[PDB]
Design a protein around this ligand. Structure first.
Ligand code: PEE
Ligand code: PEE
Ligand code: HEC
Ligand code: HEM
Ligand code: HEM
Ligand code: HEM
Ligand code: FNM
Ligand code: BOG
Ligand code: BOG
Ligand code: BOG
Ligand code: BOG
Ligand code: BOG
Lengths: 78, 379, 241, 49, 49, 67, 59, 55, 49, 48
């Protein structure tokens, strides 16, 4: 039971419409998607980098492991 | 009281935690895993009981009773898939839940965090004893490797191990006691979850901005009841897709072979959700050193609340910490990968690196960068 | 040392997510098991009744079972006796215990095949490649006596002599009994033996997917519908001033 | 059996090497492969225990 | 979805395939004198002939 | 008589450049290893390279011709 | 005026809304099962025992 | 249905074990509810008259 | 009282009398040619001769 | 079970060796007989 004793708030007006008076998923192209791109963009160079790094280390270590399974012709030349 | 929802001693409780509960208006999808975890728990228990009703804990009947379940029990195979994959779903959700916590500094809610760590440890013990039950090659040998870890403890080690086993090695008395434990622990998890949520309600949820939401709260219902049901079905698709279209994608084929005490599989590898920890265990070539490293790899979580140096709660406005965060995540990815490979170059070195950087990021970089960030804000 | 050849991926007609098993191929595979593999391989978890409505009619199944003698008892004298099989009987074991088995195979133990495709990396792909992949050892390699060369088997020296060859049997359905045709069929049968629920599992997956798509959409709307109130909500700070 | 870089034994779990006597030469393994208490008193036999 | 899942779970507690697998038993009528009553276990319960 | 399509197709795929090159390297290994009396070398690797290339090829056609 | 008619007759009263969900589920089930079962069997023509059966049936 | 067959047998035994293992915990849980309702009023006493004047 | 009850309960989880009942096994050194390693199950673990 | 109750360990061992018990299978998958061990249970007079 917390509603009523949460915070001291003054001079704020808010306006809302019934859910039946509005669209559930409005402005998909004019607003939604443009923002999804904004969000994506603003995080790709924070996230992607380390994952790219791991991906490389993976590729290398995997290839290097298989490379060491191959025969070294220089072991039977003579 | 004019309305029952508030006066009745039982409804009062449902009302104060799932109807009139004040919740921040801005919590994202990262706040969905709490309820998903709760549903995994209820789900695992339900399917677990159904399986238990046809299972037999005896080394001579375990493997076949599971076969009998999947082959003769109506929808036996279904129930078994759901239980087996449900465990994975459980770990996927617990790892994200934890990540969310670290990122948004939820750990500043110390009691909720600490019980949270207990929950993880308990869930892990549950999975371990549960995994032994079918009694396949992987079940047996994994159980062997793990239980033998405890023999590393000086003096009492050998004694504790043989005690745990009920004999001189993993055998039938180990199996029957593991079944009991597996049946019991899920309920300790359920109990402790209540404590978890009880500490949490002392303060209510944290939010993505890390700033007080008292100026903008909303009833849990219908906002989050609906948002949570949505989250459930979204995560339920991959679960069921995996379970119904790739039942064995995540499992070792070695566990389709009855346990053989005399033959150890060529490549003993743990379930995916324990891989990273395994990698850490192997990083230190010393028996006891590896155990400590492993212990610390999880107990380190108890330390997180004391390494917070930032003047801000979350990492939302901390670009340096954010990079450091994803490095850590990637670091865990590497450890997972390294954990599935054999102990051989280049893996061994890559492994020790990732292990070493794992502890470094948490113990040194995070608090250091946190202090550095405060100064760049002129604090 | 740890050099290994990995089988390629064959396009089995039951590989797709909604692809059932070819029951004709499974029926044929059963014959291959019954007339060739069952001489050394057990299939402890499959009973003759399992065939009914899958690959055989009840009559055929009953007959198949009666072809076998099973031990029963004790009788009134406390004696064990033999009797003709029943559809409730499981497939007969070629040997009383692994000791006897090895003893009849140069110390090698032919594994039970009930879950073999799930107990081996590669599944049918691996079982197919192994059955149709024997050949002479490469230069520098010598297989010990009793073993055979197979690049697909780990270590490459298996204790199982090539089990199948052209016309080693005659499919009563008329299919040309060629070695690869045979391997293909038995492997299909093995996939079935390992997971009898295979088909029903996929029919469910189909429904799971449809219902899920539908339900996920309907719930997405409802979540958006309720939240619209907050999503479009506007506010202003009007201090007295 | 008959494996490892010491002609003894090799443990496939974490790579512990043992010589033909059963002693630990390489790997993580702390001590040597336990030698059970046995007596040879028995022509072409061995009573172990 | 609920009706199905509950139906599946519920039926997982009813007779399994192996149990439903039911046969017949033959009994020679030359082992029971005139008036005797022999009991043969069968489909769980006792069979009185 | 009777002819197993696996034979047909195997012979066809062995004409492939990848197979031919592999087959070539194999014979060279075989030749030298067979000619020496004190060498550790083995042609498992070249054999695998060959079998691997041949068989991957086989996999694509073989089932088309089976029932 | 389906949405309108639907609302007044089915969705207005909480009681009628419940009966609608029951009959709806009943009709949906029958239709969804048969349809899904068709789609599956169609994608596998000639492979099910349903398809092969006739060859060996001889009761 | 309860039996899992045509008479008390093995499937009856294994499901009974599971139930026996589970129920004690339902008993523990419901005990909490028992005590929770009880505390709304506190205990009754042998005289059946209010004890608020002497607790 | 507590020390005793806890002691009793604790020890009920350690090796039971049937498990502690341990015997020996005889192995004829005839089935073992020079250079070989035969494994025999024994007291749970493998016995290497 | 007799040891330390009614008999000494030696007596008990003797008692058990007086009995032949079935064991195996052996290397041929054969069942064989052997002298009793204190870990053996008292012999059944009949198979069933
Ligand atoms: C442990 C075992 C490890 C096993 C493997 C781990 C699984 C790896 C799969 C990757 C998971 C997908 C995550 C990609 C999410 C990308 C994304 O959206 O990141 C940016 C986004 C930006 O948010 P804001 O700063 O609030 O900005 C909003 C507007 N102001 O950040 C977030 O979503 C918050 C971070 C929470 C995700 C945490 C998940 C990581 C999970 C792994 C376990 C890690 C923790 C263990 C620690 C010990
Ligand atoms: C053939 C099959 C036969 C089916 C038998 C079951 C019969 C069940 C019928 C019960 C009657 C239901 C009617 C509920 C009436 C209450 C109500 O207001 O509607 C629900 C109400 C909606 O509110 P309003 O939009 O404001 O409606 C006001 C209209 N005047 O609340 C909801 O949104 C609930 C409905 C969403 C369901 C959420 C479930 C999603 C989860 C998916 C997982 C899948 C299920 C698996 C179950 C496993 C269980 C072990
Ligand atoms: C004369 C006995 C014999 C026959 C007949 C036979 N097998 Fe085997 N099989 C063996 C033996 C022996 C092994 C053990 C190989 C080893 O471990 O060295 C084996 C092993 C196998 C394995 C794989 C073992 C592994 O480790 O990968 C499979 C799969 C298999 N057999 C399939 C078949 C199938 C299918 C058939 C019939 C088409 C068949 N076998 C017929 C003797 C036989
Ligand atoms: C069976 C295990 C668990 C269950 C069922 C569970 C459940 C919950 C629930 C229902 C919530 C509220 C909703 C949410 O924020 O997601 C929650 C919150 C939380 N849990 Fe857990 N939890 C579990 C494990 C953990 C773990 C492993 C940790 C941390 C090591 C943890 C830390 C927290 C914290 C700190 C919060 C606060 C969320 C916030 O920032 O507002 N939980 N958990
Ligand atoms: C936190 C919840 C649970 C988790 C994480 C969990 C996890 C697991 C795991 C990892 C397995 C092995 C699956 C496999 O065969 O590969 C398992 C087996 C099993 N679990 Fe659970 N379980 C949970 C709860 C329960 C409960 C409450 C019961 C029963 C009252 C139970 C009963 C069983 C049974 C009978 C098996 C053996 C049969 C089988 O392996 O399919 N489990 N569980
Ligand atoms: C596992 C079973 C039960 C447990 C653990 C339990 C426990 C308790 C406890 C701890 C109390 C408070 C102390 C006392 O007055 O004795 C209590 C009170 C009470 N219980 Fe139970 N109880 C159980 C079963 C029942 C049953 C079977 C009934 C009646 C059908 C019952 C009726 C009550 C009532 C009415 C009280 C009020 C006592 C008063 O007059 O102040 N209880 N019970
Ligand atoms: C009963 S063996 C086992 N239990 C699991 C599920 C587990 C272990 C530890 C903590 C939680 C869960 C697991 O991955 N393994 N396998 C395994 C295989 C090799 C080495 C170690 C473990
Ligand atoms: C019904 C769902 C319950 C979820 C667990 C939330 C915890 O715990 C708290 O204890 C208080 C005193 O009894 C109650 O008044 C609160 O409502 C309750 O949340
Ligand atoms: C008295 C009512 C008896 C009804 C018998 C129910 C039989 C269930 O039949 C089921 O049909 C499914 C769809 O074809 C299959 O996928 C399942 O394997 C099969 O068991
Ligand atoms: C959100 C996930 C919803 C899953 C609902 C799908 C219901 C599963 O449908 C199942 O299909 C089987 C195959 O025909 C039948 O044998 C089962 O009786 C039926 O319940
Ligand atoms: C330690 C167990 C105490 C009994 C639980 C009573 C809890 C209900 O108590 C209520 O909260 C008051
Ligand atoms: C009110 C509870 C009283 C409990 C005290 C009982 C203590 C019994 O103690 C037991 O006595 C046995 C007899 O020698 C010993 O063999 C046991 O080891 C010992 O634990």
């Amino acid at each position: 039971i917390h509603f009523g004793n949460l915070a001291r708030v003054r001079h704020i007006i808010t306006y809302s419409l019934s859910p039946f008076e509005q669209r559930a998923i409005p402005n998909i192209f004019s607003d939604a998607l443009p923002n999804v791109w904004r969000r994506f963009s603003s995080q790709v160079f924070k996230v992607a980098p380390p994952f790219l790094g791991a991906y490389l280390l993976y590729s290398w270590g995997t290839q290097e492991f298989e490379r060491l399974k191959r025969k070294n012709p220089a072991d039977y030349e003579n | 009281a004019p309305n029952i929802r508030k006066s009745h001693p039982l409804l009062k409780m449902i009302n104060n935690s799932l109807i009139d509960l004040p919740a921040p208006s801005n919590i994202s999808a990262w706040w969905n895993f709490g309820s998903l975890l709760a549903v995994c728990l209820m789900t695992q228990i339900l399917t677990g009981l159904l399986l238990a009703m046809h299972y037999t804990a005896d080394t001579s009947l375990a493997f076949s009773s599971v076969a009998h379940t999947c082959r003769n029990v109506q929808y036996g195979w279904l129930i078994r898939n759901l239980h087996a994959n449900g465990a994975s779903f459980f770990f996927i959700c617990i790892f994200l839940h934890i990540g969310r916590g670290l990122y948004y500094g939820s750990y500043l809610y110390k009691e909720t965090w600490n019980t949270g760590v207990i929950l993880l440890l308990t869930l892990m013990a549950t999975a371990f004893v549960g995994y032994v039950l079918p009694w396949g090659q992987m079940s047996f040998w994994g159980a062997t490797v793990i239980t033998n870890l405890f023999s590393a403890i000086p003096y009492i080690g050998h004694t504790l191990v043989e005690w745990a086993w009920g004999g001189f090695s993993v055998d039938n008395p180990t199996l029957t006691r593991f079944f009991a434990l597996h049946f019991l622990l899920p309920f300790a998890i359920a109990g402790i979850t209540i404590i978890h949520l009880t500490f949490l309600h002392e303060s209510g949820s944290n939010n993505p901005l890390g700033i007080s939401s008292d100026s903008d709260k909303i009833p849990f219902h219908p906002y989050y009841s609906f948002k949570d049901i949505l989250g459930l079905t979204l995560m339920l698709t991959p679960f069921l897709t995996l379970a119904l279209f790739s039942p064995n994608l995540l499992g070792d084929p070695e566990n389709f072979t009855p346990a053989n005490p005399l033959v150890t599989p060529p490549h003993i590898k743990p379930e995916w959700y324990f891989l990273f920890a395994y990698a850490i265990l192997r990083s230190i070539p010393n028996k006891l050193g590896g155990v400590l490293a492993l212990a610390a790899s999880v107990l380190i979580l108890f330390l997180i609340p004391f390494l917070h140096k930032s003047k801000q709660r979350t990492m939302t406005f901390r670009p340096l910490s954010q990079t450091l965060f994803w490095l850590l995540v990637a670091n865990l990815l590497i450890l997972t990968w390294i954990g599935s490979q054999p102990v051989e170059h280049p893996f061994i070195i890559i492994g020790q690196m990732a292990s070493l950087s794992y502890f470094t990021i948490l113990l040194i970089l995070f608090p250091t960068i946190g202090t550095l960030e405060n100064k760049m804000l002129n604090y | 040392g740890e050099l290994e050849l990995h089988p390629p991926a064959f396009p089995w007609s039951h590989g797709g997510p909604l692809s059932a098993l070819d029951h004709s191929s499974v029926r044929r595979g059963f014959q291959v098991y019954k007339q060739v593999c069952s001489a050394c391989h057990s299939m402890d978890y499959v009973a003759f009744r399992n065939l009914i409505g899958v690959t055989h009619t009840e009559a055929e199944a009953k007959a198949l079972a009666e072809e076998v003698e099973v031990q029963d008892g004790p009788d009134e004298n406390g004696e064990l006796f033999m009797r003709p099989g029943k559809i409730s009987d499981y497939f007969p074991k070629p040997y009383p215990n692994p000791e006897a088995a090895r003893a009849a195979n140069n110390g090698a133990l032919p594994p039970d095949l009930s879950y073999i495709v799930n107990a081996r990396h590669g599944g049918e792909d691996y079982v197919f490649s192994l059955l149709t992949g024997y050949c002479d050892p490469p230069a520098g390699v010598v297989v010990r006596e009793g073993l055979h060369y197979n690049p697909y088997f780990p270590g490459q020296a298996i204790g199982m002599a090539p089990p199948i060859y052209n016309e080693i049997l005659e499919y009563d359905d008329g299919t040309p009994a060629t070695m690869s045709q045979i391997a293909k069929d038995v492997c299909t049968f093995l996939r079935w033996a390992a997971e009898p629920e295979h088909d029903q599992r996929k029919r469910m997956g189909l429904k799971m997917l449809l219902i899920s798509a539908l339900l996920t959409s309907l719930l997405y709307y409802m979540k958006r519908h309720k939240w619209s109130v907050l999503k479009s909500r506007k506010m202003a700070y009007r201090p007295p001033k | 059996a008959n494996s490892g870089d010491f002609g003894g034994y090799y443990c496939p779990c974490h790579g512990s090497h043992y010589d033909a006597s059963g002693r630990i030469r390489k790997g993580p393994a702390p001590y040597n492969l336990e030698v059970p208490t046995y007596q040879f008193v028995g022509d072409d036999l061995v009573v172990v225990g | 979805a609920a009706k199905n899942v509950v139906t599946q779970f519920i039926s997982s507690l009813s007779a399994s395939a192996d149990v439903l697998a039911l046969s017949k038993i033959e009994i020679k009528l030359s082992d029971i004198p005139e008036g005797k009553n022999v009991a043969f276990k069968w489909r769980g319960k006792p069979l009185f002939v | 008589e009777l002819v197993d399509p696996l034979t047909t197709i195997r012979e066809h795929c062995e004409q492939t450049e990848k197979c031919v090159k592999a087959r070539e390297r194999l014979e060279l290994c075989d030749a030298r290893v067979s000619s020496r009396s004190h060498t550790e070398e083995q042609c498992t690797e070249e054999l695998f390279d060959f079998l691997h290339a041949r068989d991957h090829c086989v996999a694509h056609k073989l089932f088309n011709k089976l029932k | 005026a389906l949405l309108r008619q639907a609302y007044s007759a089915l969705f207005r009263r909480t009681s009628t809304f419940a009966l609608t969900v029951v009959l709806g589920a009943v009709l949906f089930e029958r239709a969804f099962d048969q349809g899904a079962d068709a789609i599956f069997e169609h994608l596998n023509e000639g492979k099910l025992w349903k398809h092969i059966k006739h060859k060996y049936e001889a009761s």
